[PDB]
């Protein structure tokens, strides 16, 4: 609401131009662009405290900034490199707020070498075992998403058309199917646990939804397969009385 | 030691 | 023990001149070179014991420039009335022939903070060894300033400190001679 | 170039009493030479000094995060900066140089000392004079040193001894200079 | 030898209703008087302020978290008495200098909240696909919070770590892990490794 940046996800090729936009509605004087790496933390790329001017931060190599008005601060990558894949965060602050930082939602950027290594996921749901039912009077459904690239996916469970959360337990991060390669496709699973009687109701509908982030429009696609755009892939199952 | 800047407030 | 530290800023339109300095008990700790974006210490020793991030001063200056534009319009474009300076010339040490000394030109009680100061010897300009301070705040919110001239006293040399200011009708000449 | 000028000033002020034990902070805004709004740490809010600053007082007092910094500046700014330069500002001591020379008037020239708190005395035959003693007062050279001149209106008699005595926090025992016939 | 914020490295896993303490100390050479901040980043969301303190000696608190600005030991340790399922996020310790642009961030600490179990019943089960009954997966579940799941065997078998509970789950909190393969010459008993294994 205060600071909004776009796009939230992008996939681009090496040597291509990527620009990240950032808008704030707080009339703040400072704007910043940070980079989020898992082992390094949050590093400053460029900042601005006055319009039409930009100051270089700590790691400005390979990035360029521009602040054409007090409300907008863009980050331009002239020739995108593999080293520039990270989550980019925009921020603002002003003295009238004591220079506390306000952050945007984040821009997750993945850069690849051929753009044809991105695949949407394949989703399947597995029904509970009778052994669990007889032993614990509980039923655990397992969802499995495989063969997707990049690993930017969000998984959710839907029971009778409404999202559920109680009983859901998802993996912390996807695992690499080919952990030796730098272009490995990923896999992710999640568990939904209910009562035995709830699963034994044939009127109860279970659906596993996987939000995938991939290509956008205006991306040249000349492959036999379908263009791996940002989409949702789903797998469902119905309860069984016996 | 490092001197602190006290900030000037911004009107309007 | 009574002490006063002041962080003093001004901004001047339409000259677009800004200043940022710290005052301790009437003396300058440091100011920021707005052009070079650098901290300048009044005494070189100060830079061995303390430091300052100048971008804080540049931030305050950009804010003061924006506040001034809003205040100019809110005052219905009421401008400043010039106040001419008082000028006095003294030495920092009792004078003796050929013993090194310094002429001090004290420019005081004036606004806006813009002046032209010139040292003259026998009516000709001199620049060897000269140095000067920035504009120093006064408690009545006018300004003061020092200009310095190291020199060897003689019976045959005469000196003048020539200051120009928009509040003066003609350049003010403050004269100094041996004894 | 007779164009009109417009002057913005800002003074952030830290007043120290008994070291850093009492501290008063002032966030002061000026238009030309007119103070129009100020924050006093003893008040806790911005107050308009003139009607020209009533909009700024009302708006800034609505910025609670702005007030939190000002209300804390006695600690986060005043006492902080005091400590940062203490060793070369509060603790600065420079010895005065003392020179006596005849001007029927004797001058005692005390030059180059810091800080300004000083006492200069004239003595005639071991007795301190009070008539005919005039002083320039404290004169700031602009470079962290003071000077001061103290004149003695006296009728020099043969054998009389005149002594100038300077007391200064940088000295463990007063400095004295003598002038005779 | 400059500016730095040192945080608890990597991840930190805690069970529900249990205490938490995240380490944060700092060392500065170009800051004047720091303000101290904790920022939190929940899954999917961006960064947002959790708490802050302006003057040394005082503490901020929000959502049951607490941190004290301590200038004696230049620390800002984040604490919470009873952790909730909604407290799973990445926590960043930071300091800023209010009069300029400077900010120093720590490397961030990930919090994983898991189920608190006092009646464990560790066992593995076998599930079938709802479309082709040929595909199958194994499920290790109902184990205590002390159990650590090893991950290896062969490169054509996959195993996940302990799952993180849903941020807004309020029931059926159970630790679980899943394994699957394609070799069709290994079963759920051979996978992973007193429990149950039918
Ligand atoms: C700037 O102009 C406004 C408008 O003329 C001034 O406000 C008026 O001030 C007079 C007093 O001199 C009042 O009698 C009026 O009622 C005010 N309002 C209006 C609409 O006229 C304001 O005082 C001026 N500011 C300065 C600094 O002179
Ligand atoms: C200080 O001296 C300069 C001389 O360079 C004066 O400014 C220039 O000359 C005319 C007057 O002779 C000014 O009107 C122009 O604005 C100046 N031209 C420049 C600077 O390129 C300046 O006005 C003097 N300042 C004062 C306060 O007397
Ligand atoms: C001056 O400073 C401190 C205050 O805590 C103390 O040493 C001393 O008692 C103070 N003097 C007075 C008169 O309060």
mmCIF file of N, CA and C in Angstrom, chain C residues 9-91:
data_model
loop_
_atom_site.group_PDB
_atom_site.id
_atom_site.type_symbol
_atom_site.label_atom_id
_atom_site.label_comp_id
_atom_site.label_asym_id
_atom_site.label_seq_id
_atom_site.Cartn_x
_atom_site.Cartn_y
_atom_site.Cartn_z
ATOM 1 N N UNK C 9 22.332 25.936 9.913
ATOM 2 C CA UNK C 9 22.157 25.793 8.487
ATOM 3 C C UNK C 9 21.549 27.076 7.942
ATOM 4 N N UNK C 10 21.962 27.457 6.734
ATOM 5 C CA UNK C 10 21.103 28.383 6.002
ATOM 6 C C UNK C 10 21.013 27.978 4.537
ATOM 7 N N UNK C 11 20.027 28.566 3.847
ATOM 8 C CA UNK C 11 19.927 28.468 2.399
ATOM 9 C C UNK C 11 19.446 29.806 1.846
ATOM 10 N N UNK C 12 20.075 30.240 0.750
ATOM 11 C CA UNK C 12 19.913 31.590 0.220
ATOM 12 C C UNK C 12 19.455 31.547 -1.239
ATOM 13 N N UNK C 13 18.232 32.065 -1.501
ATOM 14 C CA UNK C 13 17.762 32.280 -2.853
ATOM 15 C C UNK C 13 17.866 33.753 -3.207
ATOM 16 N N UNK C 14 18.153 34.057 -4.473
ATOM 17 C CA UNK C 14 18.297 33.125 -5.593
ATOM 18 C C UNK C 14 19.730 32.664 -5.858
ATOM 19 N N UNK C 15 20.657 32.994 -4.958
ATOM 20 C CA UNK C 15 22.042 32.561 -5.110
ATOM 21 C C UNK C 15 22.185 31.045 -5.095
ATOM 22 N N UNK C 16 21.235 30.323 -4.492
ATOM 23 C CA UNK C 16 21.341 28.876 -4.339
ATOM 24 C C UNK C 16 22.568 28.478 -3.517
ATOM 25 N N UNK C 17 22.908 29.282 -2.515
ATOM 26 C CA UNK C 17 24.051 29.027 -1.643
ATOM 27 C C UNK C 17 23.596 28.442 -0.315
ATOM 28 N N UNK C 18 24.134 27.277 0.029
ATOM 29 C CA UNK C 18 23.811 26.639 1.291
ATOM 30 C C UNK C 18 25.041 26.472 2.171
ATOM 31 N N UNK C 19 24.856 26.439 3.491
ATOM 32 C CA UNK C 19 25.981 26.233 4.383
ATOM 33 C C UNK C 19 25.527 25.341 5.520
ATOM 34 N N UNK C 20 26.481 24.604 6.099
ATOM 35 C CA UNK C 20 26.193 23.663 7.181
ATOM 36 C C UNK C 20 27.417 23.603 8.068
ATOM 37 N N UNK C 21 27.249 23.949 9.337
ATOM 38 C CA UNK C 21 28.416 24.002 10.203
ATOM 39 C C UNK C 21 28.022 23.693 11.643
ATOM 40 N N UNK C 22 29.009 23.286 12.424
ATOM 41 C CA UNK C 22 28.795 23.041 13.843
ATOM 42 C C UNK C 22 29.546 24.093 14.646
ATOM 43 N N UNK C 23 28.873 24.616 15.661
ATOM 44 C CA UNK C 23 29.415 25.634 16.535
ATOM 45 C C UNK C 23 29.548 25.073 17.944
ATOM 46 N N UNK C 24 30.693 25.340 18.558
ATOM 47 C CA UNK C 24 30.928 25.032 19.957
ATOM 48 C C UNK C 24 31.335 26.334 20.627
ATOM 49 N N UNK C 25 30.464 26.867 21.488
ATOM 50 C CA UNK C 25 30.822 28.004 22.321
ATOM 51 C C UNK C 25 31.345 29.176 21.485
ATOM 52 N N UNK C 26 30.888 29.276 20.253
ATOM 53 C CA UNK C 26 31.216 30.383 19.387
ATOM 54 C C UNK C 26 32.307 30.109 18.384
ATOM 55 N N UNK C 27 32.834 28.893 18.352
ATOM 56 C CA UNK C 27 33.887 28.489 17.441
ATOM 57 C C UNK C 27 33.356 27.380 16.555
ATOM 58 N N UNK C 28 33.978 27.229 15.401
ATOM 59 C CA UNK C 28 33.536 26.275 14.408
ATOM 60 C C UNK C 28 34.270 24.972 14.649
ATOM 61 N N UNK C 29 33.505 23.893 14.823
ATOM 62 C CA UNK C 29 34.105 22.567 14.809
ATOM 63 C C UNK C 29 34.465 22.173 13.382
ATOM 64 N N UNK C 30 33.472 22.261 12.475
ATOM 65 C CA UNK C 30 33.626 21.926 11.059
ATOM 66 C C UNK C 30 32.468 22.481 10.223
ATOM 67 N N UNK C 31 32.694 22.510 8.910
ATOM 68 C CA UNK C 31 31.627 22.793 7.957
ATOM 69 C C UNK C 31 31.745 21.789 6.820
ATOM 70 N N UNK C 32 30.718 21.752 5.984
ATOM 71 C CA UNK C 32 30.685 20.849 4.843
ATOM 72 C C UNK C 32 30.904 21.666 3.573
ATOM 73 N N UNK C 33 31.928 21.305 2.815
ATOM 74 C CA UNK C 33 32.107 21.820 1.463
ATOM 75 C C UNK C 33 30.978 21.291 0.596
ATOM 76 N N UNK C 34 29.998 22.147 0.318
ATOM 77 C CA UNK C 34 28.859 21.737 -0.489
ATOM 78 C C UNK C 34 29.282 21.304 -1.903
ATOM 79 N N UNK C 35 30.329 21.915 -2.475
ATOM 80 C CA UNK C 35 30.737 21.560 -3.839
ATOM 81 C C UNK C 35 31.441 20.219 -3.907
ATOM 82 N N UNK C 36 32.329 19.938 -2.963
ATOM 83 C CA UNK C 36 33.111 18.711 -2.978
ATOM 84 C C UNK C 36 32.483 17.607 -2.146
ATOM 85 N N UNK C 37 31.373 17.900 -1.462
ATOM 86 C CA UNK C 37 30.681 16.937 -0.610
ATOM 87 C C UNK C 37 31.642 16.336 0.410
ATOM 88 N N UNK C 38 32.336 17.199 1.144
ATOM 89 C CA UNK C 38 33.404 16.797 2.051
ATOM 90 C C UNK C 38 33.323 17.567 3.363
ATOM 91 N N UNK C 39 33.769 16.914 4.426
ATOM 92 C CA UNK C 39 33.879 17.570 5.721
ATOM 93 C C UNK C 39 35.190 18.341 5.806
ATOM 94 N N UNK C 40 35.106 19.613 6.179
ATOM 95 C CA UNK C 40 36.277 20.455 6.381
ATOM 96 C C UNK C 40 36.339 20.800 7.867
ATOM 97 N N UNK C 41 37.434 20.405 8.539
ATOM 98 C CA UNK C 41 37.619 20.674 9.972
ATOM 99 C C UNK C 41 38.277 22.034 10.162
ATOM 100 N N UNK C 42 37.803 22.783 11.166
ATOM 101 C CA UNK C 42 38.383 24.100 11.410
ATOM 102 C C UNK C 42 39.849 23.982 11.780
ATOM 103 N N UNK C 43 40.164 23.014 12.639
ATOM 104 C CA UNK C 43 41.530 22.667 12.994
ATOM 105 C C UNK C 43 41.786 21.257 12.479
ATOM 106 N N UNK C 44 42.901 21.071 11.773
ATOM 107 C CA UNK C 44 43.207 19.769 11.185
ATOM 108 C C UNK C 44 43.170 18.649 12.225
ATOM 109 N N UNK C 45 43.606 18.931 13.456
ATOM 110 C CA UNK C 45 43.594 17.927 14.513
ATOM 111 C C UNK C 45 42.209 17.339 14.725
ATOM 112 N N UNK C 46 41.153 18.105 14.439
ATOM 113 C CA UNK C 46 39.823 17.580 14.719
ATOM 114 C C UNK C 46 39.545 16.332 13.905
ATOM 115 N N UNK C 47 40.085 16.255 12.683
ATOM 116 C CA UNK C 47 39.836 15.123 11.810
ATOM 117 C C UNK C 47 40.555 13.854 12.201
ATOM 118 N N UNK C 48 41.390 13.909 13.231
ATOM 119 C CA UNK C 48 42.025 12.728 13.773
ATOM 120 C C UNK C 48 41.223 12.093 14.896
ATOM 121 N N UNK C 49 40.229 12.784 15.436
ATOM 122 C CA UNK C 49 39.493 12.285 16.582
ATOM 123 C C UNK C 49 38.001 12.131 16.327
ATOM 124 N N UNK C 50 37.497 12.653 15.221
ATOM 125 C CA UNK C 50 36.084 12.532 14.961
ATOM 126 C C UNK C 50 35.920 12.489 13.456
ATOM 127 N N UNK C 51 34.737 12.050 13.021
ATOM 128 C CA UNK C 51 34.379 11.997 11.611
ATOM 129 C C UNK C 51 32.911 12.373 11.436
ATOM 130 N N UNK C 52 32.511 12.605 10.187
ATOM 131 C CA UNK C 52 31.137 12.998 9.896
ATOM 132 C C UNK C 52 30.752 12.523 8.494
ATOM 133 N N UNK C 53 29.549 11.941 8.360
ATOM 134 C CA UNK C 53 28.974 11.569 7.061
ATOM 135 C C UNK C 53 28.273 12.790 6.462
ATOM 136 N N UNK C 54 28.861 13.383 5.410
ATOM 137 C CA UNK C 54 28.367 14.667 4.889
ATOM 138 C C UNK C 54 26.990 14.573 4.240
ATOM 139 N N UNK C 55 26.593 13.380 3.776
ATOM 140 C CA UNK C 55 25.333 13.253 3.043
ATOM 141 C C UNK C 55 24.154 13.617 3.932
ATOM 142 N N UNK C 56 24.336 13.533 5.262
ATOM 143 C CA UNK C 56 23.334 14.090 6.150
ATOM 144 C C UNK C 56 23.224 15.596 5.986
ATOM 145 N N UNK C 57 24.345 16.272 5.748
ATOM 146 C CA UNK C 57 24.231 17.712 5.626
ATOM 147 C C UNK C 57 23.584 18.072 4.298
ATOM 148 N N UNK C 58 23.953 17.357 3.234
ATOM 149 C CA UNK C 58 23.350 17.603 1.932
ATOM 150 C C UNK C 58 21.847 17.334 1.955
ATOM 151 N N UNK C 59 21.418 16.358 2.748
ATOM 152 C CA UNK C 59 19.993 16.079 2.871
ATOM 153 C C UNK C 59 19.250 17.250 3.496
ATOM 154 N N UNK C 60 19.740 17.705 4.650
ATOM 155 C CA UNK C 60 19.198 18.894 5.298
ATOM 156 C C UNK C 60 19.199 20.115 4.366
ATOM 157 N N UNK C 61 20.257 20.304 3.561
ATOM 158 C CA UNK C 61 20.264 21.444 2.646
ATOM 159 C C UNK C 61 19.133 21.320 1.622
ATOM 160 N N UNK C 62 18.956 20.134 1.013
ATOM 161 C CA UNK C 62 17.868 19.971 0.043
ATOM 162 C C UNK C 62 16.516 20.249 0.683
ATOM 163 N N UNK C 63 16.328 19.785 1.918
ATOM 164 C CA UNK C 63 15.108 20.115 2.637
ATOM 165 C C UNK C 63 15.015 21.620 2.895
ATOM 166 N N UNK C 64 16.111 22.273 3.303
ATOM 167 C CA UNK C 64 15.968 23.702 3.600
ATOM 168 C C UNK C 64 15.602 24.476 2.331
ATOM 169 N N UNK C 65 16.187 24.097 1.191
ATOM 170 C CA UNK C 65 15.851 24.763 -0.061
ATOM 171 C C UNK C 65 14.374 24.595 -0.387
ATOM 172 N N UNK C 66 13.821 23.418 -0.107
ATOM 173 C CA UNK C 66 12.406 23.228 -0.379
ATOM 174 C C UNK C 66 11.551 23.991 0.621
ATOM 175 N N UNK C 67 11.985 24.059 1.884
ATOM 176 C CA UNK C 67 11.203 24.824 2.845
ATOM 177 C C UNK C 67 11.222 26.312 2.485
ATOM 178 N N UNK C 68 12.355 26.798 2.002
ATOM 179 C CA UNK C 68 12.449 28.217 1.737
ATOM 180 C C UNK C 68 11.486 28.624 0.621
ATOM 181 N N UNK C 69 11.327 27.768 -0.384
ATOM 182 C CA UNK C 69 10.421 28.115 -1.465
ATOM 183 C C UNK C 69 8.984 28.181 -0.962
ATOM 184 N N UNK C 70 8.596 27.257 -0.096
ATOM 185 C CA UNK C 70 7.262 27.347 0.483
ATOM 186 C C UNK C 70 7.102 28.585 1.369
ATOM 187 N N UNK C 71 8.151 28.976 2.097
ATOM 188 C CA UNK C 71 8.064 30.096 3.030
ATOM 189 C C UNK C 71 8.100 31.425 2.295
ATOM 190 N N UNK C 72 8.936 31.531 1.269
ATOM 191 C CA UNK C 72 8.876 32.700 0.405
ATOM 192 C C UNK C 72 7.451 33.002 -0.050
ATOM 193 N N UNK C 73 6.732 31.986 -0.555
ATOM 194 C CA UNK C 73 5.369 32.222 -1.016
ATOM 195 C C UNK C 73 4.428 32.500 0.152
ATOM 196 N N UNK C 74 4.656 31.880 1.303
ATOM 197 C CA UNK C 74 3.724 32.098 2.405
ATOM 198 C C UNK C 74 3.882 33.495 3.001
ATOM 199 N N UNK C 75 5.086 34.076 2.926
ATOM 200 C CA UNK C 75 5.294 35.460 3.325
ATOM 201 C C UNK C 75 4.881 36.467 2.244
ATOM 202 N N UNK C 76 4.176 36.036 1.188
ATOM 203 C CA UNK C 76 3.828 36.911 0.068
ATOM 204 C C UNK C 76 5.084 37.512 -0.562
ATOM 205 N N UNK C 77 6.116 36.685 -0.700
ATOM 206 C CA UNK C 77 7.377 37.057 -1.354
ATOM 207 C C UNK C 77 8.107 38.202 -0.648
ATOM 208 N N UNK C 78 7.948 38.300 0.678
ATOM 209 C CA UNK C 78 8.633 39.323 1.467
ATOM 210 C C UNK C 78 10.133 39.079 1.498
ATOM 211 N N UNK C 79 10.950 39.978 0.969
ATOM 212 C CA UNK C 79 12.390 39.730 0.915
ATOM 213 C C UNK C 79 13.080 40.203 2.186
ATOM 214 N N UNK C 80 14.355 39.834 2.283
ATOM 215 C CA UNK C 80 15.202 40.217 3.406
ATOM 216 C C UNK C 80 15.672 41.653 3.223
ATOM 217 N N UNK C 81 15.718 42.388 4.322
ATOM 218 C CA UNK C 81 16.339 43.701 4.317
ATOM 219 C C UNK C 81 17.819 43.550 4.669
ATOM 220 N N UNK C 82 18.683 44.109 3.820
ATOM 221 C CA UNK C 82 20.121 44.015 4.025
ATOM 222 C C UNK C 82 20.516 44.745 5.287
ATOM 223 N N UNK C 83 21.433 44.144 6.033
ATOM 224 C CA UNK C 83 22.037 44.778 7.196
ATOM 225 C C UNK C 83 23.531 44.909 6.920
ATOM 226 N N UNK C 84 24.071 46.124 6.812
ATOM 227 C CA UNK C 84 25.499 46.271 6.519
ATOM 228 C C UNK C 84 26.357 45.784 7.676
ATOM 229 N N UNK C 85 27.572 45.285 7.398
ATOM 230 C CA UNK C 85 28.491 44.845 8.457
ATOM 231 C C UNK C 85 29.267 45.951 9.147
ATOM 232 N N UNK C 86 29.546 45.724 10.421
ATOM 233 C CA UNK C 86 30.671 46.369 11.084
ATOM 234 C C UNK C 86 31.944 45.565 10.827
ATOM 235 N N UNK C 87 33.036 46.266 10.523
ATOM 236 C CA UNK C 87 34.349 45.692 10.223
ATOM 237 C C UNK C 87 35.379 46.270 11.197
ATOM 238 N N UNK C 88 36.190 45.409 11.821
ATOM 239 C CA UNK C 88 37.332 45.822 12.641
ATOM 240 C C UNK C 88 38.560 45.017 12.220
ATOM 241 N N UNK C 89 39.735 45.623 12.298
ATOM 242 C CA UNK C 89 40.986 44.972 11.933
ATOM 243 C C UNK C 89 41.894 45.012 13.145
ATOM 244 N N UNK C 90 42.403 43.854 13.543
ATOM 245 C CA UNK C 90 43.315 43.753 14.672
ATOM 246 C C UNK C 90 44.345 42.691 14.330
ATOM 247 N N UNK C 91 45.371 42.591 15.166
ATOM 248 C CA UNK C 91 46.339 41.507 15.088
ATOM 249 C C UNK C 91 46.025 40.481 16.161
#
